[PDB]
């Protein structure tokens, strides 16, 4: 089997992407944030504290003839941005782009933190990291991908995120019309539960490539590109007036600037992030100070190849017995 679903930016800045997901019988369609940096599929629901719901579409398990309470199971997750959610668990039928999994753990939120409430466009998350990170207790549950894997034509999914435009998540096949050139594959460590790999270096604008190993994660659920302070300083040094602001919480730059591109290495191959992808707009409405899309990972503890990087590529998440990651230009 295969599946194919369109993923759409939630706003004009590509702060996140939502993908429609069918849950239950009859189908209840929710728009979920596909997140290769976590491993829980959770949704706003009829159980969510009412004051914490503001515009989201909810899953109502009592209206699904295939929903079954997973007795005794609870979940609780906290993300790198300090947000969180928790609740109980149902199993139900879940379909993405025509690909159907029966008995999928659907984690129903009883509580969500303010940033989730405040984002009316995101009805929940669909985790696509390794199932070892799944938070369900006392019996850990599998991700949608893990459940679908054996049924797929090939044990892969691909992320093709758009810049200020829709893109595609495919399951079980590689669309050879969706990228240019070849796909370069690189090794993955699953030791931390992430799609963790090592970039071979970087360049700033038309500058020379610096060969240096950068260990990090491919994370569709993180907006920006977080890299070591040395790398990030080298980038912003090429933008007149750019500076790191502790009050704003990162590098900012004059909105009048033209940003240079940023290249990252995948083996001997190179992925080029156009300068415009690194502009996240005014820090506040009407400001002429703009927020940078490349930020320091110092004190996160991990480098993160988030959407800024991934949207510049066609990305293969290869879930074979020995997982690997593939990147192509597009």
Short mmCIF file of C-alpha atoms in Angstrom, two decimals:
data_model
loop_
_atom_site.label_atom_id
_atom_site.label_comp_id
_atom_site.label_asym_id
_atom_site.label_seq_id
_atom_site.Cartn_x
_atom_site.Cartn_y
_atom_site.Cartn_z
CA UNK A 1 0.00 0.00 0.00
CA UNK A 2 0.89 3.69 -0.24
CA UNK A 3 -0.47 7.03 0.93
CA UNK A 4 -0.09 10.59 -0.31
CA UNK A 5 -1.32 13.73 1.47
CA UNK A 6 -0.85 17.42 0.88
CA UNK A 7 0.69 19.45 3.69
CA UNK A 8 -0.09 23.18 3.93
CA UNK A 9 1.59 26.03 5.85
CA UNK A 10 -0.52 27.37 8.73
CA UNK A 11 0.43 30.97 8.04
CA UNK A 12 2.36 33.29 5.72
CA UNK A 13 5.67 32.52 7.44
CA UNK A 14 5.56 28.69 7.28
CA UNK A 15 5.57 28.53 11.11
CA UNK A 16 4.24 24.97 10.82
CA UNK A 17 2.46 22.68 8.36
CA UNK A 18 -0.84 20.85 8.68
CA UNK A 19 -1.90 17.65 6.95
CA UNK A 20 -5.46 16.29 6.95
CA UNK A 21 -5.93 12.96 8.78
CA UNK A 22 -9.07 10.79 8.91
CA UNK A 23 -9.82 9.31 12.36
CA UNK A 24 -12.62 6.94 13.22
CA UNK A 25 -15.79 5.63 11.60
CA UNK A 26 -17.36 7.61 10.06
CA UNK A 27 -14.24 9.61 9.39
CA UNK A 28 -13.50 12.67 11.49
CA UNK A 29 -10.94 14.77 9.62
CA UNK A 30 -8.44 16.66 11.74
CA UNK A 31 -5.51 18.77 10.56
CA UNK A 32 -2.38 17.47 12.26
CA UNK A 33 1.21 18.71 12.53
CA UNK A 34 3.39 15.84 11.23
CA UNK A 35 6.41 15.83 13.51
CA UNK A 36 9.52 13.71 12.79
CA UNK A 37 10.87 14.88 16.16
CA UNK A 38 8.27 13.15 18.37
CA UNK A 39 6.36 9.88 18.48
CA UNK A 40 2.87 10.56 19.82
CA UNK A 41 -0.28 10.96 17.71
CA UNK A 42 -2.47 13.19 19.87
CA UNK A 43 -5.58 15.23 19.16
CA UNK A 44 -7.84 17.89 20.56
CA UNK A 45 -10.95 16.00 21.58
CA UNK A 46 -14.32 16.00 23.31
CA UNK A 47 -12.31 15.36 26.50
CA UNK A 48 -10.15 18.48 26.24
CA UNK A 49 -10.73 21.07 28.97
CA UNK A 50 -13.24 23.42 27.36
CA UNK A 51 -11.40 26.65 28.22
CA UNK A 52 -8.33 25.21 26.44
CA UNK A 53 -10.13 24.73 23.11
CA UNK A 54 -10.32 27.81 20.86
CA UNK A 55 -11.28 27.02 17.27
CA UNK A 56 -9.70 23.60 16.83
CA UNK A 57 -11.56 20.66 15.33
CA UNK A 58 -12.00 17.95 17.96
CA UNK A 59 -12.09 14.17 17.82
CA UNK A 60 -15.15 12.74 19.56
CA UNK A 61 -14.50 9.04 20.18
CA UNK A 62 -18.08 8.34 21.30
CA UNK A 63 -19.16 9.12 17.71
CA UNK A 64 -16.73 6.59 16.22
CA UNK A 65 -17.97 3.02 15.98
CA UNK A 66 -14.38 1.76 15.76
CA UNK A 67 -13.01 3.67 18.78
CA UNK A 68 -12.04 1.63 21.84
CA UNK A 69 -10.71 3.02 25.11
CA UNK A 70 -7.23 1.66 25.78
CA UNK A 71 -7.87 0.79 29.39
CA UNK A 72 -5.55 2.37 31.94
CA UNK A 73 -3.36 4.14 29.38
CA UNK A 74 -2.30 7.75 29.84
CA UNK A 75 0.15 10.03 28.08
CA UNK A 76 2.00 13.25 28.80
CA UNK A 77 4.49 15.06 26.58
CA UNK A 78 6.60 18.21 26.69
CA UNK A 79 8.22 19.71 23.60
CA UNK A 80 11.45 21.63 23.09
CA UNK A 81 9.58 24.94 22.98
CA UNK A 82 8.15 24.38 26.46
CA UNK A 83 4.65 23.43 25.29
CA UNK A 84 2.86 20.32 26.55
CA UNK A 85 -0.27 18.18 26.48
CA UNK A 86 -1.62 15.07 28.21
CA UNK A 87 -4.61 12.78 28.41
CA UNK A 88 -5.89 9.25 27.83
CA UNK A 89 -5.84 6.87 24.86
CA UNK A 90 -8.16 5.26 22.36
CA UNK A 91 -7.39 2.90 19.53
CA UNK A 92 -9.15 3.68 16.24
CA UNK A 93 -8.79 3.60 12.47
CA UNK A 94 -6.51 6.31 11.11
CA UNK A 95 -5.99 7.12 7.44
CA UNK A 96 -3.49 9.48 5.82
CA UNK A 97 -3.78 10.19 2.12
CA UNK A 98 -5.51 6.87 1.42
CA UNK A 99 -3.26 4.72 3.64
CA UNK A 100 -5.21 3.12 6.49
CA UNK A 101 -4.02 1.77 9.84
CA UNK A 102 -6.43 -0.08 12.11
CA UNK A 103 -5.86 -0.14 15.87
CA UNK A 104 -3.77 3.03 15.91
CA UNK A 105 -3.25 4.64 19.30
CA UNK A 106 -5.00 8.01 19.20
CA UNK A 107 -4.02 10.01 22.26
CA UNK A 108 -6.92 12.17 23.39
CA UNK A 109 -5.94 15.43 25.09
CA UNK A 110 -7.50 16.27 28.44
CA UNK A 111 -5.10 19.21 28.87
CA UNK A 112 -3.04 21.32 26.46
CA UNK A 113 -0.73 24.27 27.15
CA UNK A 114 -1.47 27.81 26.06
CA UNK A 115 0.46 27.78 22.79
CA UNK A 116 -1.67 24.90 21.52
CA UNK A 117 -4.91 26.61 22.57
CA UNK A 118 -3.73 29.80 20.87
CA UNK A 119 -3.09 28.05 17.56
CA UNK A 120 -6.53 27.43 16.10
CA UNK A 121 -5.10 25.83 12.95
CA UNK A 122 -3.46 22.80 14.58
CA UNK A 123 -5.81 20.05 15.80
CA UNK A 124 -3.00 17.83 17.12
CA UNK A 125 0.33 16.19 16.25
CA UNK A 126 1.24 13.04 14.36
CA UNK A 127 4.64 11.79 15.50
CA UNK A 128 7.03 10.20 13.03
CA UNK A 129 10.20 9.74 15.11
CA UNK A 130 10.97 6.29 16.54
CA UNK A 131 8.40 4.57 18.70
CA UNK A 132 10.87 4.32 21.59
CA UNK A 133 9.99 7.97 22.34
CA UNK A 134 6.24 7.36 22.60
CA UNK A 135 4.94 8.58 25.96
CA UNK A 136 1.98 6.23 26.53
CA UNK A 137 2.10 4.51 29.92
CA UNK A 138 2.12 1.76 31.08
CA UNK A 139 2.22 0.22 27.60
CA UNK A 140 4.16 2.22 25.03
CA UNK A 141 2.43 2.57 21.67
CA UNK A 142 3.67 2.54 18.07
CA UNK A 143 3.66 5.45 15.62
CA UNK A 144 1.44 5.56 12.56
CA UNK A 145 4.48 4.83 10.37
CA UNK A 146 5.58 1.91 12.55
CA UNK A 147 2.08 0.41 12.33
CA UNK A 148 1.82 0.93 8.55
CA UNK A 149 5.34 -0.22 7.71
CA UNK A 150 4.81 -3.90 6.94
CA UNK A 151 1.92 -3.04 4.62
CA UNK A 152 3.80 -0.39 2.67
CA UNK A 153 5.25 -1.10 -0.79
CA UNK A 154 8.60 0.17 0.58
CA UNK A 155 9.25 0.97 4.28
CA UNK A 156 9.71 4.71 3.77
CA UNK A 157 8.00 8.06 4.01
CA UNK A 158 9.05 11.29 2.31
CA UNK A 159 8.71 14.95 3.29
CA UNK A 160 8.44 17.55 0.52
CA UNK A 161 7.69 20.80 2.33
CA UNK A 162 6.91 23.93 0.39
CA UNK A 163 8.26 27.44 0.76
CA UNK A 164 5.21 29.63 1.26
CA UNK A 165 3.29 26.90 -0.63
CA UNK A 166 1.75 23.46 -0.14
CA UNK A 167 3.85 20.30 -0.26
CA UNK A 168 3.47 16.57 0.19
CA UNK A 169 3.97 13.69 2.62
CA UNK A 170 4.15 10.33 0.88
CA UNK A 171 4.12 6.91 2.51
CA UNK A 172 5.50 3.75 0.99
CA UNK A 173 6.99 5.09 -2.25
CA UNK A 174 9.50 7.59 -3.60
CA UNK A 175 8.05 9.99 -6.20
CA UNK A 176 10.89 10.26 -8.70
CA UNK A 177 9.24 13.30 -10.34
CA UNK A 178 9.42 15.32 -7.11
CA UNK A 179 13.16 16.05 -7.04
CA UNK A 180 16.07 16.90 -9.30
CA UNK A 181 19.34 15.01 -9.59
CA UNK A 182 19.97 12.09 -7.24
CA UNK A 183 19.04 11.32 -3.65
CA UNK A 184 22.08 11.17 -1.36
CA UNK A 185 21.62 8.80 1.56
CA UNK A 186 23.34 9.22 4.88
CA UNK A 187 23.53 7.17 8.11
CA UNK A 188 21.05 7.50 10.96
CA UNK A 189 21.51 6.90 14.66
CA UNK A 190 18.34 5.92 16.49
CA UNK A 191 20.08 6.00 19.89
CA UNK A 192 18.11 9.09 21.02
CA UNK A 193 14.92 8.06 19.21
CA UNK A 194 15.33 10.72 16.49
CA UNK A 195 16.22 10.77 12.79
CA UNK A 196 19.74 11.77 13.82
CA UNK A 197 22.46 12.18 11.20
CA UNK A 198 25.73 14.05 10.58
CA UNK A 199 25.99 16.84 8.06
CA UNK A 200 29.37 17.15 6.38
CA UNK A 201 29.60 20.94 6.60
CA UNK A 202 28.28 24.28 5.42
CA UNK A 203 28.75 27.38 3.31
CA UNK A 204 27.40 30.93 3.68
CA UNK A 205 26.25 32.56 0.45
CA UNK A 206 28.87 32.19 -2.27
CA UNK A 207 31.57 31.44 0.33
CA UNK A 208 33.82 28.41 0.40
CA UNK A 209 32.45 25.19 1.88
CA UNK A 210 33.68 24.37 5.39
CA UNK A 211 34.09 20.65 5.94
CA UNK A 212 33.00 19.90 9.48
CA UNK A 213 30.76 17.28 11.08
CA UNK A 214 27.45 18.59 12.40
CA UNK A 215 25.36 16.01 14.23
CA UNK A 216 21.67 16.89 14.27
CA UNK A 217 18.09 15.76 13.77
CA UNK A 218 15.71 15.98 10.84
CA UNK A 219 12.67 17.50 12.52
CA UNK A 220 9.62 18.54 10.53
CA UNK A 221 8.02 19.74 13.77
CA UNK A 222 10.58 22.47 14.39
CA UNK A 223 10.22 25.69 12.36
CA UNK A 224 13.80 26.93 12.26
CA UNK A 225 17.35 25.69 11.68
CA UNK A 226 19.34 25.41 14.92
CA UNK A 227 23.09 25.00 14.53
CA UNK A 228 26.26 25.51 16.61
CA UNK A 229 27.02 29.07 17.69
CA UNK A 230 30.17 29.20 15.54
CA UNK A 231 28.20 28.37 12.38
CA UNK A 232 25.35 30.74 13.18
CA UNK A 233 27.74 33.62 13.96
CA UNK A 234 29.49 33.07 10.62
CA UNK A 235 26.13 33.28 8.81
CA UNK A 236 24.82 36.45 10.45
CA UNK A 237 28.20 38.18 10.14
CA UNK A 238 27.36 38.40 6.42
CA UNK A 239 24.21 40.43 7.09
CA UNK A 240 24.80 44.12 7.79
CA UNK A 241 23.14 45.12 11.05
CA UNK A 242 22.35 41.58 12.20
CA UNK A 243 22.75 40.92 15.91
CA UNK A 244 21.81 38.44 18.60
CA UNK A 245 19.16 39.91 20.88
CA UNK A 246 18.62 38.29 24.28
CA UNK A 247 15.43 40.36 24.68
CA UNK A 248 13.95 38.99 21.45
CA UNK A 249 15.45 35.53 21.92
CA UNK A 250 17.80 35.13 18.98
CA UNK A 251 19.35 36.71 15.93
CA UNK A 252 17.43 39.57 14.34
CA UNK A 253 18.29 41.55 11.22
CA UNK A 254 17.13 44.68 9.38
CA UNK A 255 14.02 43.85 7.38
CA UNK A 256 15.59 45.86 4.53
CA UNK A 257 18.39 43.26 4.16
CA UNK A 258 18.82 40.76 1.37
CA UNK A 259 19.80 37.52 3.09
CA UNK A 260 22.53 35.22 1.79
CA UNK A 261 21.83 31.56 1.12
CA UNK A 262 23.02 28.80 3.45
CA UNK A 263 24.34 25.50 2.16
CA UNK A 264 24.55 22.28 4.17
CA UNK A 265 26.38 19.08 3.26
CA UNK A 266 24.89 15.62 2.92
CA UNK A 267 27.85 13.39 2.18
CA UNK A 268 29.47 14.83 -0.92
CA UNK A 269 26.17 16.50 -1.93
CA UNK A 270 24.99 20.01 -1.10
CA UNK A 271 21.56 21.42 -0.24
CA UNK A 272 21.13 25.17 -0.77
CA UNK A 273 18.67 27.10 1.43
CA UNK A 274 17.80 30.33 -0.40
CA UNK A 275 18.18 33.50 1.62
CA UNK A 276 14.47 34.26 1.51
CA UNK A 277 13.76 30.99 3.40
CA UNK A 278 15.68 32.44 6.36
CA UNK A 279 13.41 35.52 6.73
CA UNK A 280 10.73 35.08 9.42
CA UNK A 281 9.49 38.64 9.25
CA UNK A 282 8.99 41.48 11.71
CA UNK A 283 9.57 40.59 15.37
CA UNK A 284 6.30 42.39 16.12
CA UNK A 285 3.72 43.93 13.82
CA UNK A 286 5.13 47.01 12.11
CA UNK A 287 8.70 46.52 13.30
CA UNK A 288 11.62 46.95 10.93
CA UNK A 289 13.58 44.32 12.87
CA UNK A 290 13.08 40.85 11.39
CA UNK A 291 13.57 37.44 13.01
CA UNK A 292 16.22 35.10 11.64
CA UNK A 293 15.52 31.56 10.47
CA UNK A 294 18.95 30.27 11.51
CA UNK A 295 19.53 30.31 15.26
CA UNK A 296 22.00 28.93 17.78
CA UNK A 297 21.47 25.47 19.25
CA UNK A 298 23.69 26.32 22.21
CA UNK A 299 21.77 25.29 25.30
CA UNK A 300 19.22 23.19 23.34
CA UNK A 301 21.69 20.36 23.56
CA UNK A 302 21.11 19.19 20.00
CA UNK A 303 21.32 20.64 16.50
CA UNK A 304 17.99 20.70 14.66
CA UNK A 305 17.48 20.60 10.91
CA UNK A 306 13.96 22.03 11.07
CA UNK A 307 11.60 23.21 8.35
CA UNK A 308 13.94 26.01 7.14
CA UNK A 309 16.42 23.32 6.07
CA UNK A 310 14.06 20.50 5.16
CA UNK A 311 11.84 22.61 2.87
CA UNK A 312 14.91 23.20 0.64
CA UNK A 313 15.01 19.44 -0.05
CA UNK A 314 13.10 16.31 -0.92
CA UNK A 315 13.71 14.19 2.18
CA UNK A 316 13.48 10.38 2.44
CA UNK A 317 12.91 8.87 5.87
CA UNK A 318 13.99 5.29 5.22
CA UNK A 319 12.63 2.94 7.88
CA UNK A 320 14.40 -0.19 6.70
CA UNK A 321 15.94 -2.50 9.32
CA UNK A 322 18.89 -0.11 9.34
CA UNK A 323 17.29 3.30 8.92
CA UNK A 324 18.83 6.00 6.73
CA UNK A 325 17.98 9.53 5.54
CA UNK A 326 18.03 10.70 1.95
CA UNK A 327 18.21 14.28 0.64
CA UNK A 328 17.75 15.57 -2.89
CA UNK A 329 17.53 19.06 -4.33
CA UNK A 330 14.21 19.96 -5.95
#
